Subunit: 115 residues, 4 copies
């Protein structure tokens, strides 16, 4: 589990369930190439995105499809998606958790990088 | 200018208007003494809380009444009020802006501190 | 586990470890009375604060001693503590997690209330 | 006035000054076309990005170069840049303020949208 994503809903105070998440890796020609994807669980978590073998150093983008989440709940959103762009560095610790807290016109994100 | 409060609404994408804000100062007997209060303008801002002379050093609590705000908007909130507790002016006068961003089950607050 | 607290550090991207947390309940004379307390674990979590028996409806305050956390790391903080004040309502779901994300001059908090 | 960006620093309690901001607009071929760019002032604000005439409807991305900011300050950051993607002006012109609050391993962004 080198990479995990956790998504929370600030309107209802709950995990954000069945949210699509796409991860991309920056290629040498500076295009974004698909890397991993999935949908959040009942707990707002998405596990099993990648393996240690596949998750090499580089620049990654995590796109969380927030507009589809809100629209389906009957709530008008502002963003198309939430995006988190970061460099994976082997020097530091080994497990990355990208967390996002969603509101219709705002979001917060953090990374927790542990060993 | 010594103390400003600015409140935004993350559900509607707007200033949070007519929000009640109370400021307290910790007294020597460790109780919270009322200091100043006001309600936010149409821009989500509250100025005129205090003057430099009245705003002495100590421990201040800024209580923003988020629950009344969300109830007026027709939305069920979790928190009773967002609170921000800080020591002010302990190395001389500063200008403080306390900003809050509100959602029904969450808030985010920051401070900008400047030296006149 | 009706009440859990989780604290994260936005400067280092890590759990906030050994942070003191005090919980109070509003008494009938509108004073705050001590209810529970503890220190966050290596994972930034504080479990076992209360039992279902003790955690009745009412107004609660969670005080997280952030100033002591930062000062010990050699980083100058703004707040005395982070405070979260909320009503526990039996109507809604049964487990409350209060999460806080700390920075030296800012913090974010959310509640996740699940069944 | 149609597009403003405002950036704050949660480590120092200050505006984030001289932060580079790039705006892109999604083209018909689904690539991101440069639209406007600037750097934040001493108040953490960036105005003058566009005019009402130039700011047509579509999908915009506001990329705030947080990594250069933290590196200048001497602090190790996680993110490459904070990104905010949104559809603008699809029901006529609006005024958008995009605010971001930065920490080394986290950021929080909101929007205030007003109808002139
Ligand atoms: C806590 C938090 C606060 C803010 C504040 C944004 C903000 C926006 C404005 C413009 O409307 C003005 C101020 N000042 C300095 C009065 C702050 C923005 C975000 C994204 C947050 O999370
Ligand atoms: C206030 C705030 C909270 C959070 C939550 C992070 C968070 C991350 C995790 C995974 O490690 C676990 C929880 N729970 C439910 C215990 C919360 C994330 C951000 C970005 C926020 O701003």
């Amino acid at each position: 589990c080198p990479l995990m994503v956790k998504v929370l809903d600030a309107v209802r105070g709950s995990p954000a369930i069945n949210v699509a998440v796409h991860v991309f890796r920056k290629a040498a020609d500076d295009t974004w190439e698909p890397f991993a994807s999935g949908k959040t669980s009942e707990s707002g978590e998405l596990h099993g995105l990648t393996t240690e073998e596949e998750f090499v150093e580089g620049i990654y983008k995590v796109e969380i499809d927030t507009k589809s989440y809100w629209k389906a709940l009957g709530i008008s959103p502002f963003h198309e998606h939430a995006e988190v762009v970061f460099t994976a560095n082997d020097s530091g610790p080994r497990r990355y958790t990208i967390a996002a807290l969603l509101s219709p016109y705002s979001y917060s994100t953090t990374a927790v990088v542990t060993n």
